[PDB]
Enzyme design. Structure first.
Site, short mmCIF file in Angstrom:
data_model
loop_
_atom_site.label_atom_id
_atom_site.label_comp_id
_atom_site.label_asym_id
_atom_site.label_seq_id
_atom_site.Cartn_x
_atom_site.Cartn_y
_atom_site.Cartn_z
N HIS A 154 8.79 14.80 5.36
CA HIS A 154 9.51 13.53 5.31
C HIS A 154 11.02 13.69 5.19
CE1 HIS A 154 9.13 13.73 0.75
NE2 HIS A 154 10.27 13.07 0.81
N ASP A 207 2.59 16.89 4.28
CA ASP A 207 4.03 16.65 4.16
C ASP A 207 4.82 17.96 4.05
OD1 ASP A 207 6.37 15.16 4.07
OD2 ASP A 207 6.17 14.65 1.96
N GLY A 261 15.90 13.01 -3.99
CA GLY A 261 16.61 14.13 -3.41
C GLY A 261 16.14 15.49 -3.86
N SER A 276 12.71 16.47 -3.51
CA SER A 276 11.56 16.93 -2.74
C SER A 276 11.90 18.26 -2.08
CB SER A 276 11.13 15.88 -1.71
OG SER A 276 12.06 15.70 -0.67
C1 LIG Z 1 6.94 11.00 7.77
O1 LIG Z 1 5.83 11.82 7.64
C2 LIG Z 1 5.32 11.89 6.39
C3 LIG Z 1 4.13 12.73 6.13
C4 LIG Z 1 3.52 12.88 4.79
C5 LIG Z 1 4.21 12.11 3.68
N1 LIG Z 1 3.56 12.29 2.42
C6 LIG Z 1 4.18 11.56 1.38
C7 LIG Z 1 3.60 11.69 -0.01
C8 LIG Z 1 5.42 10.71 1.63
O2 LIG Z 1 5.91 10.10 0.54
C9 LIG Z 1 7.13 9.30 0.73
C10 LIG Z 1 8.33 10.26 0.56
C11 LIG Z 1 8.25 10.61 -0.92
C12 LIG Z 1 9.57 10.78 -1.70
O3 LIG Z 1 10.37 9.92 -1.91
N2 LIG Z 1 9.72 12.12 -2.15
C13 LIG Z 1 10.68 12.55 -3.13
C14 LIG Z 1 12.09 12.75 -2.77
O4 LIG Z 1 12.94 13.14 -3.55
N3 LIG Z 1 12.32 12.52 -1.38
S1 LIG Z 1 13.87 12.76 -0.92
O5 LIG Z 1 14.30 14.14 -1.11
O6 LIG Z 1 14.74 11.80 -1.58
C15 LIG Z 1 13.93 12.30 0.83
C16 LIG Z 1 13.41 10.88 1.15
C17 LIG Z 1 15.11 12.83 1.65
C18 LIG Z 1 13.73 13.46 1.78
C19 LIG Z 1 10.22 13.26 -4.40
C20 LIG Z 1 10.63 11.80 -4.49
C21 LIG Z 1 11.70 11.24 -5.42
C22 LIG Z 1 11.71 10.01 -5.93
C23 LIG Z 1 10.66 8.95 -5.61
C24 LIG Z 1 11.46 7.84 -4.93
C25 LIG Z 1 10.58 6.62 -4.55
C26 LIG Z 1 9.46 7.03 -3.54
C27 LIG Z 1 8.10 7.21 -4.29
C28 LIG Z 1 7.00 7.81 -3.39
N4 LIG Z 1 5.80 7.96 -4.12
C29 LIG Z 1 4.54 8.11 -3.45
O7 LIG Z 1 4.36 7.98 -2.28
O8 LIG Z 1 3.57 8.39 -4.42
C30 LIG Z 1 2.26 8.43 -3.96
C31 LIG Z 1 1.44 7.71 -5.05
C32 LIG Z 1 1.83 9.85 -3.88
F1 LIG Z 1 0.48 9.88 -3.68
F2 LIG Z 1 2.56 10.39 -2.86
F3 LIG Z 1 2.12 10.49 -5.02
C33 LIG Z 1 7.49 9.18 -2.92
O9 LIG Z 1 7.86 10.04 -3.69
N5 LIG Z 1 7.71 9.46 -1.51
C34 LIG Z 1 7.25 8.44 -0.32
N6 LIG Z 1 6.06 10.53 2.88
C35 LIG Z 1 5.41 11.25 3.92
C36 LIG Z 1 5.99 11.11 5.30
#
Ligand SMILES: COc1ccc2nc(C)c(O[C@@H]3C[C@H]4C(=O)N[C@]5(C(=O)NS(=O)(=O)C6(C)CC6)C[C@H]5/C=C\CCCCC[C@H](NC(=O)O[C@H](C)C(F)(F)F)C(=O)N4C3)nc2c1
Ligand SMILES: [Zn+2]
Length: 198
Positions: A76, A100, A156, A158
């Site tokens: 992602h 992911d 930020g 991940s």
């Molecule tokens: C497109 O193809 C894809 C394939 C597989 C895939 N698989 C997952 C699980 C996914 O999840 C998206 C992105 C992450 C995220 O934001 N990642 C962090 C992060 O820091 N990203 S980032 O670096 O800012 C960034 C966006 C620049 C890269 C670590 C998060 C930090 C804070 C949370 C912020 C609110 C969000 C809360 C969410 N929670 C959640 O979905 O929880 C449930 C219940 C789960 F089951 F997943 F746990 C969450 O975390 N998500 C939502 N997108 C995809 C997409």
């Protein structure tokens, strides 16, 4: 029109989390203008060091972690993008949207973490701000923060590692589990899922 179709730039290393000493701290190694140019050319001549890289595209910034000779991050964040390197864009060697997960060969000069075989549930999440956050492992891909905090603080990060007490890699931070904006738990890609993909 085909003549006008654009190409997405490369992921670019813009800094690292220094874990070499007694104090963890973030270091920036490239600013935004240089990041933008390097993303377009895919040519990054900067020296790489360390295990946890701070990476950026034109629109996102996140982390990437070297484990067993592979620089791992989240789909992602990176999509299917190349990463910039001294000799130009490097194509992913692993891509798994279902997890992911993406990976490229680890950059020359990086240090790789060792996959954990300890079976310990006392973990540490390393963030892009070089916070070292205690996490109790709660399943194959879940852990609870011992001290919850707003999701803002995890955004930020991940692609960053969960480490065991001995400093081995246990997983790659994927998602935050939140209630009313408060992160109580984290979702991560276990290292065995990486070692399977390998
Ligand atoms: C497109 O193809 C894809 C394939 C597989 C895939 N698989 C997952 C699980 C996914 O999840 C998206 C992105 C992450 C995220 O934001 N990642 C962090 C992060 O820091 N990203 S980032 O670096 O800012 C960034 C966006 C620049 C890269 C670590 C998060 C930090 C804070 C949370 C912020 C609110 C969000 C809360 C969410 N929670 C959640 O979905 O929880 C449930 C219940 C789960 F089951 F997943 F746990 C969450 O975390 N998500 C939502 N997108 C995809 C997409
Ligand atoms: Zn271990």
């Amino acid at each position: 029109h085909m003549a006008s179709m654009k190409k997405k730039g490369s992921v670019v290393i813009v800094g690292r989390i220094n874990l070499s000493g007694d104090t963890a701290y973030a270091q920036q190694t490239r600013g935004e203008e240089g990041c933008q140019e390097t993303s377009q050319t895919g040519r990054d001549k900067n020296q790489v060091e360390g295990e946890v890289q701070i990476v950026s595209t034109a629109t996102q910034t996140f982390l990437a972690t070297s484990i067993n000779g592979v620089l791992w991050t989240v789909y992602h964040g990176a999509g299917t993008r190349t990463i910039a390197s001294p000799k130009g864009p490097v194509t992913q060697m692993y891509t798994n949207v279902d997890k992911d997960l993406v990976g490229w060969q680890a950059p020359q000069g990086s240090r790789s973490l060792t996959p954990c075989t300890c079976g310990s549930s006392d973990l540490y999440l390393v963030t892009r701000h070089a916070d070292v956050i205690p996490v109790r492992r709660r399943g194959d891909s879940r852990g609870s923060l011992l001290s919850p905090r707003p999701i803002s603080y995890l955004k930020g990060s991940s692609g960053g590692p969960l480490l065991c007490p001995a400093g081995h890699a246990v997983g790659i931070f994927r998602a935050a589990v939140s209630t009313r904006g408060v992160a109580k738990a984290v979702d991560f890609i276990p290292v065995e899922s990486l070692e399977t993909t390998m």
